[PDB]
Amino acid sequence: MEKLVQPTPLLLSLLKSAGAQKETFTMKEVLYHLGQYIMAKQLYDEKQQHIVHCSNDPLGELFGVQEFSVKEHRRIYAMISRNLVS
């Protein structure tokens, strides 16, 4: 299996709210649940659906931004990385 990561508490709370029922993940799983979270809460822009609006949301605190594009993979990996236990 791919490497296992441990989300810090704030990220863990987000992943669980999206439906995760464990505390240890592969990066693929973290990405999956983040997508599910964004979709369920409809944080994406209705007309430009690759844009995520995350002000007034834990995701914004986690990523340190008010908006981002799902196309920004390197940035998203970095934002996730600062929310994993080293």
Ligand X SMILES: CCOc1cc(C(C)(C)C)ccc1C1=N[C@@](C)(c2ccc(Cl)cc2)[C@@](C)(c2ccc(Cl)cc2)N1
Residues within the interface to ligand X (CB under 6 A): 31, 34-35, 38-39, 44, 49-50, 70, 73, 76-77
Integer Cα distance of 56 and 10 in angstroms: 14
First-last CA distance in the chain: 19
Q: For residues 4 and 39, which CB has a smaller minimum distance to ligand X in the complex?
A: 39
With respect to ligand X, which residue has the nearer C-beta, 19 or 77? 77
In the complex, least distance from residue 28 CB atom to ligand X, rounded to whole angstroms: 9
Closer CB to ligand X, residue 23 or residue 67?
67
Taking phi first (over 0 means left), then psi (-120 to 50 degrees means alpha), and beta for anything else, what does residue 42 get? left
